[PDB]
């Protein structure tokens, strides 16, 4: 089908990437730098760490957000249904939460085998919550050399948009209900093979095994979480 579970796609990814730019993002696939060796804290200082000056007073907000890098858990990702295949560089991982791969498909749904080279190739991914089908949201790397993200709408002298978690800042808002991207909590990621290439500033995160229940089904998953500076168990 359009999606593929079990951590095995075949080749039908979009092999369209760029080489003019000298940034060498593709060349940065063999190795990753240290936390402080790549100037992360400049790019990590633009979002509020723990408690975002809010209390509260269930609804969904469309709004918008299209500009800033999705490198920390604050975001308002938009809804994406179809994307041209000329822009995609690498697998497009979508989160059930369990990672799943979507491959290039023709307009009418016919699978195509061209490594994404042919012009007409597109990707159909109608972001939708698993309770109604499909995946919460998902991520890939654009051809020009920058990460992208997309997903469902955030739910409900300061402001707070919650794309995930916000347990204490909402009447028990959970991932199964409001989760959009791979951010299970403010400091946890849904680990997948290419995680270190789309989020290279989470290299220092430690590994973890987790169990989750969404709707009426159960998912066994491996997550990545750093040393949270308050507590391990809640």
């Amino acid at each position, epitope marked *: 089908l359009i999606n593929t579970n079990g951590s095995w*796609h075949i*080749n039908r990814t979009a092999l369209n990437c760029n080489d003019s730019l000298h940034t060498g993002f593709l060349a940065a696939l*063999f190795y990753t730098h240290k936390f402080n060796a790549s100037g992360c804290p400049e790019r990590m200082a633009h979002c509020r760490p723990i408690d975002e000056f809010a209390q509260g007073w269930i609804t969904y907000a469309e709004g918008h957000g299209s500009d800033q890098r999705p490198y920390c858990w604050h975001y308002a990702p938009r809804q994406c249904g179809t994307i041209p295949a000329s822009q995609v560089c690498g697998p497009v991982y979508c989160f059930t939460p369990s990672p799943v791969v979507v491959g290039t498909t023709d307009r009418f749904g016919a699978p195509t085998y061209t490594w994404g080279e042919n012009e007409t190739d597109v990707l159909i991914l109608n972001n939708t919550r698993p309770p109604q089908g499909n995946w919460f949201g998902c991520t890939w790397m654009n051809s020009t050399g920058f990460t992208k993200t997309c997903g469902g709408p955030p739910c409900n002298n300061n402001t707070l948009t919650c794309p995930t978690d916000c347990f204490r800042k909402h009447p028990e808002a959970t991932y199964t209900k409001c989760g959009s991207g791979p951010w299970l909590t403010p400091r946890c990621l849904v680990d997948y093979p290419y995680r*270190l*290439w789309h989020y290279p500033c989470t290299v220092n995160f430690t590994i973890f095994k987790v169990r989750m229940y969404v709707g009426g089904v159960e998912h066994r998953l491996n997550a990545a979480c750093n040393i949270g500076h308050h507590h391990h168990h809640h």
Partner: antibody, heavy 111, light 107 residues
Framework: AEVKKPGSSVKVSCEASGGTHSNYVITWVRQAPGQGLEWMGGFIPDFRTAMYAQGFQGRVTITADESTSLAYMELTNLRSEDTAVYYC????????????WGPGTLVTVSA | SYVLTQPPSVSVAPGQTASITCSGDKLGDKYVSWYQQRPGQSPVLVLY???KRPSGIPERFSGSNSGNTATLTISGTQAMDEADYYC?????????FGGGTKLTVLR
């Protein structure tokens, strides 16, 4: 072993993905007798793009076949300096440490 | 050009602690790796990412990296720890192997 004539070409082969997820990166390291290790290049089954070292920019060519699930480097115009043992390593995808160094292949040329 | 330097040889007596140094420019900002190679055998990983050791390596091995030096430390050295040790790092989209250091134990 059998000595390769100077100016000829040799091939070094390795196992590779058959057209599915790999989750590893391949690399080639040459060791002259008692002279240490030298890198040549790396290859990613998922992205066919290779990566060659500077010193050997003009003589190495890395290519892979998916039907045979085998990726090899061709080295051309061997000289007296290119007698050595070749190791083929397979490391994790994005951690940059090579593990499971495979059996070495010796290549000799006669001045 | 990027080049890493190590001492040529180190000699220790059994039961003592041996230290091997891999040096470079601002090496502390890199993820160094260590390989152990016996004569005529393919090298095997002994330390990756400074202090993270894989499974199957005895607890005697240890490592650290700071400033301009990465130190591989062995405790309780014995006759099965004589070998060549190599230091690996990444720079400028190129791999760099440090000069091998031969560890020999005086019987």
């Amino acid at each position: 072993a059998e000595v390769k004539k100077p100016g000829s070409s040799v091939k070094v082969s390795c196992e590779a993905s058959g057209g599915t997820h790999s989750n590893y990166v391949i690399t080639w390291v040459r060791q002259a007798p008692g002279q240490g290790l030298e890198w040549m290049g790396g290859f990613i089954p998922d992205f066919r793009t290779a990566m060659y070292a500077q010193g050997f920019q003009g003589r190495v060519t890395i290519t892979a076949d998916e039907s045979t699930s085998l990726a090899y480097m061709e080295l051309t115009n061997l000289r007296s300096e290119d007698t050595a043992v070749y190791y083929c390593a397979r490391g994790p995808l994005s951690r940059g440490y090579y593990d499971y160094w495979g059996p070495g292949t010796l290549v000799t040329v006669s001045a | 050009s990027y080049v890493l330097t190590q001492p040529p040889s180190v000699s220790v007596a059994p039961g003592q602690t041996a230290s091997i140094t891999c040096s470079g420019d601002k090496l502390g900002d890199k993820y160094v790796s260590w390989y152990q190679q016996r004569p005529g055998q393919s090298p095997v990983l002994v330390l990756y990412q400074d202090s993270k050791r894989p499974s199957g390596i005895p607890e005697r091995f240890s490592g650290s990296n700071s400033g301009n030096t990465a130190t591989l430390t062995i405790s309780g050295t014995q006759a099965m720890d004589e070998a060549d040790y190599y230091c690996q790092a990444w720079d400028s989209s190129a791999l760099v192997f440090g000069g091998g250091t031969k560890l020999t134990v005086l019987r």
